[PDB]
Amino acid sequence: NGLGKDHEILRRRIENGAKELWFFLQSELKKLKHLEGNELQRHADEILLDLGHHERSIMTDLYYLSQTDGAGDWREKEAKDLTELVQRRITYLQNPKDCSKARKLVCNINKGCGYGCQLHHVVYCFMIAYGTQRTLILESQNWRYATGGWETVFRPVSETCTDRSGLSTGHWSGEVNDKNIQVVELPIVDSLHPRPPYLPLAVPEDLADRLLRVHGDPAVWWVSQFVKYLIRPQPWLEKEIEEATKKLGFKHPVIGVHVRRTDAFHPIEEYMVHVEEHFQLLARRMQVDKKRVYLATDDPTLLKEAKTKYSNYEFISDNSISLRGVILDIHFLSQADFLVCTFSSQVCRVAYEIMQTLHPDASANFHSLDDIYYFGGQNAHNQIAVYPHKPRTEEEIPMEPGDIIGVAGNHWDGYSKGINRKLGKTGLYPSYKVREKIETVKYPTYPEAEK
Amino acid sequence: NGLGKDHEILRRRIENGAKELWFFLQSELKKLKHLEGNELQRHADEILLDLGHHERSIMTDLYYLSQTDGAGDWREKEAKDLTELVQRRITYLQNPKDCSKARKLVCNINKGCGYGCQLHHVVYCFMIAYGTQRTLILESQNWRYATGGWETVFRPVSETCTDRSGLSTGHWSGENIQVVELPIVDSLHPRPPYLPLAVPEDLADRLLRVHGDPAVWWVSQFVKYLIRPQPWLEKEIEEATKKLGFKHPVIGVHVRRTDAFHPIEEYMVHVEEHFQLLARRMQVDKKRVYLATDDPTLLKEAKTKYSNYEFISDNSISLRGVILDIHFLSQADFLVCTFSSQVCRVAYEIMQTLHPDASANFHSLDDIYYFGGQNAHNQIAVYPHKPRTEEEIPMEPGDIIGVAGNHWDGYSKGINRKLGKTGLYPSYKVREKIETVKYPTYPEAEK
């Protein structure tokens, strides 16, 4: 069971490429120290240009390393097996034989917010139902986006059990006090007391190791399984999506861009820099016939501006063809090869979540101009310091290996902001010096779903 | 038969480490454009310090990746299998049953140069003997380093056949002469194919799975057989190891001064950087350096300027001295020297026989690895290059590049043979052109 030749050649090529980059940077930075004025700026720009191509060659070799010696086919098979297992468990939970006797969790969709926020409310309900072995019952009467209900757009969340009948009923009071309550009604997350453990960003302990073999952010993978089940379309929506795909000429490669302007302002150029950079990366391993962008935005003037400012790009948008508009936007963004947006937007986060269900590991196929991935209502997102940090400025925090860091965000400039939970200090630290603290929870594993 | 969890975690951490380095560089280089004077120089220095630690963290993760999920154990087993195979073949070639009837190649060690050049002459003789299925006969009478000759330090190269007897003798004229006398490589015509940097075609694929520079591994197999020590030299080395306190981690430094000059400070920048890398994965109790040099002022200079280092030298207890220096350099965890020096190349070659893949465990202040008399060392361009200055050459993917050297600054110098043009090109844009030769495989050595 030996090492593959391609694997070893690529590993050594990545090591050598990184070494050569370090040789280059040592030489060129020392030369910059002795320049000034226009020559300093001209040479700095040239260094940046060269560095970019060098960096993308290293990233390309890393991509090949992830695929070599059967790794891509195996990752695809394991990711498929994992989602089939979870979807099987969810479907088993949701379709009891005898609805009148089934334990149930009632969720109301009419949270006071937009479509993404309402979808995520249902997900939060669903994850707790799954954790407490309760069938999710979804109440959607007079839903803002479709007054006919949830089932006018998506499939019902159960085929056998959509009725709320039960011997006992009560508001959520905790898994222990609700032990003998057949039907529990759940409020929005920011009213939930006591909080159960079945919340993001933890993942099921029984799946955690398998997921780390496949996926770079198991927490978002776990969320995405409930999104996947919820958005199973009714046949008319499925047909509308297929026909819109043709009408728009949506085809690959394509990068999705979501520009949310209705309040945090970012000019179109700050999105497109990352779009152009990713197309440069793709072109190192595939022919790019045309640079396509699927643009979703609440700014009605932006599409025309983008087309005129970037005449070498093809812009695709559903503006030509409300609930329909957001559903289609989320769909096409989720199908793109890469996603550039602001994760402060619920819409972009939904698209990123759905994206994880379409590939073995799409966890890194985004760039956010502000927030890192999060789920409203999640438990604290912590990291563990791996290397020490001594602050250079007063805005930086010290770190020793083992310190728990509560991460607020990545500034996408080498530094993150967070709080050192051994010291109580909040500030900046080098992003590379921490690792993610993955939290696991003992969920039911529904072994009966395998028979 | 799936993917290992540690393997995947480490791959993603390397990828993310590289992305974070790029975020940092993009941000900081844009800041530098708007600085001046002492502020520009203070921030450039700070960026370089921060970049060093970030780079070493990536290189550490790559080291772990090379070892994870059984890879280190497999690489060691396969590298051991490969050297056992080749040593078995050499030993079979060298020990025919009837010396009077064996085909022979005669090599005279007394080349007009120093010990490292003489040893490499014998290696060159040996590789051609191996290629032609001739038993190597080594003549070392009147050896400048010992009147008793080769066997006063190293084992005879054969146990059964050490004389020049036969029915016909002649000077090399190209591949029915039983005893052929080989000259120095500079006088060799016609050249046979059994020369560095090519490797045996039957081993090339297995070597690529194990080792980062198969050419030097192949050279090192003949070095290994030649320098088998006599029992008294074996004991002397063991005693020296004890008397000197040679132990790990330890970095080898060879400073050749007898005619280009490099000050001790230049070697020590690379020593210090490597000890910083090692400290990320192991405890470094004391920073030990084995220092070898022809300059009598240098050991004292180093000790006085680097009081935080322990400098080891066999001078603290000429053929004896070079052999011990080469031994301890070859045993070090890392080697800093000038590959223009035959002695340092010998130590690097021996080092390859002591680890699964030590190909990258050096820093040369001048030349890349080479073997005197080798055939042209070529590379293949992988990415196009458009020259920015007049000192640079253009390249298109597939162009054959004849490499003269690496300038250790991001650029190499060489000739684009398609264009006949010589100049600089980005080192990362080429890959090595590995040459293979059909050598005998000595199947009889397995029986």
Side-chain angles (χ1 to χ4, degrees), chain A residues 86-122:
Chain A
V86 173
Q87 296 303 304
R88 186 157 61 243
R89 297 175 169 175
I90 296 174
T91 306
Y92 169 87
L93 167 68
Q94 284 304 110
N95 293 279
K97 285 167 294 184
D98 185 337
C99 189
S100 70
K101 307 288 193 66
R103 282 167 78 262
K104 306 168 190 186
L105 182 154
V106 177
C107 184
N108 194 282
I109 199 181
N110 293 292
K111 190 170 173 171
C113 55
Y115 169 78
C117 164
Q118 295 187 332
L119 179 58
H120 282 143
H121 172 61
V122 177

Side-chain angles (χ1 to χ4, degrees), chain A residues 109 115 118-120 122-123 126 136 138-143 146-158 226-227 229-232 234 236-237 323:
Chain A
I109 199 181
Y115 169 78
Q118 295 187 332
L119 179 58
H120 282 143
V122 177
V123 167
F126 213 165
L136 173 67
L138 178 58
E139 299 291 279
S140 57
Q141 298 87 7
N142 291 320
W143 181 27
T147 48
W150 169 270
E151 299 80 4
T152 57
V153 177
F154 303 116
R155 289 185 62 189
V157 299
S158 175
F226 296 91
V227 179
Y229 185 99
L230 284 168
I231 62 160
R232 288 166 310 139
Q234 293 284 25
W236 48 97
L237 178 53
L323 182 59

Side-chain angles (χ1 to χ4, degrees), chain B residues 372-388:
Chain B
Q374 70 186 26
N375 287 313
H377 178 176
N378 289 315
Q379 296 166 330
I380 300 160
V382 182
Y383 311 131
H385 186 66
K386 303 188 295 269
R388 168 178 292 117

Side-chain angles (χ1 to χ4, degrees), chain B residues 309-378:
Chain B
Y309 279 80
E310 176 180 322
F311 291 92
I312 307 178
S313 171
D314 63 359
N315 177 250
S316 71
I317 59 178
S318 195
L319 176 64
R320 205 171 302 255
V322 68
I323 286 185
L324 281 186
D325 271 352
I326 287 171
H327 168 80
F328 288 113
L329 292 168
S330 74
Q331 293 274 339
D333 298 282
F334 196 72
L335 179 62
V336 184
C337 71
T338 51
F339 270 178
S340 58
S341 157
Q342 300 250 3
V343 164
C344 188
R345 295 201 310 272
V346 169
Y348 175 66
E349 294 155 355
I350 295 162
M351 176 181 292
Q352 305 312 304
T353 73
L354 301 173
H355 311 276
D357 174 12
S359 56
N361 286 10
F362 76 100
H363 187 90
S364 177
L365 304 185
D366 51 23
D367 287 302
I368 59 180
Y369 177 77
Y370 69 98
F371 191 93
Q374 70 186 26
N375 287 313
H377 178 176
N378 289 315

Side-chain angles (χ1 to χ4, degrees), chain B residues 165-270:
Chain B
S165 69
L167 295 180
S168 55
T169 297
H171 297 108
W172 176 279
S173 70
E175 284 183 83
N176 293 326
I177 302 297
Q178 186 181 339
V179 183
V180 173
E181 294 167 339
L182 193 68
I184 59 177
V185 62
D186 320 274
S187 308
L188 182 62
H189 303 285
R191 288 164 63 84
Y194 316 115
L195 293 167
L197 302 163
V199 304
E201 61 175 22
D202 62 292
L203 302 181
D205 272 340
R206 287 177 74 184
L207 278 172
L208 276 179
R209 297 175 172 98
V210 166
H211 194 277
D213 192 342
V216 65
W217 187 92
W218 181 234
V219 171
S220 78
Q221 293 306 295
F222 297 90
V223 178
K224 177 184 168 62
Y225 184 102
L226 285 171
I227 65 162
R228 285 166 311 135
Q230 293 285 30
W232 51 91
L233 175 61
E234 211 166 23
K235 283 189 300 141
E236 180 173 13
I237 289 168
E238 298 167 7
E239 291 165 12
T241 305
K242 283 159 182 145
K243 280 213 162 205
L244 297 179
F246 188 84
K247 60 203 68 183
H248 295 268
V250 58
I251 298 189
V253 175
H254 183 244
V255 183
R256 193 190 66 162
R257 289 284 174 73
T258 301
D259 33 307
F261 178 89
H262 299 277
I264 184 65
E265 289 87 354
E266 195 182 356
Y267 299 85
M268 291 299 296
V269 161
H270 296 109

Side-chain angles (χ1 to χ4, degrees), chain A residues 3 15 21 70 75 102 170 240 274 310 357 397:
Chain A
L3 296 171
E15 294 179 10
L21 186 63
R75 191 181 293 109
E240 174 141 305
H274 299 103
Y310 299 94
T357 72
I397 54 167

